[PDB]
Amino acid sequence: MIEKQMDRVVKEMRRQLEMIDKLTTREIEQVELLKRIHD
């Protein structure tokens, strides 16, 4: 009982962390792109 709930919360945190990983990655690539084109 407490064990599934806790397992379920950990699994769900890893998923939100993956979202942050991509977002930050996409933000870094967007900065790199904008740097080239801006005067």
30 has binding-site annotation: yes
Q: Which does 4 bind (CB under 5 to 8 A by kind): a second copy, Ni ion, none?
A: none
Q: For residue 37, what is the DSSP state?
A: H
Q: Which does 9 bind (CB under 5 to 8 A by kind): a second copy, Ni ion, none?
A: a second copy
The DSSP string of 3-33 is HHHHHHHHHHHHHHHHHHHHHHHHHHHHHHH
Site residues (CB under 5 A) for Ni ion, limited to 1-39? 21
Q: Which residues bind Ni ion (CB under 5 A)?
A: 21
Q: Which residues bind a second copy (CB under 8 A)?
A: 1-3, 5-7, 9-10, 12-14, 16-17, 19-31, 33-38
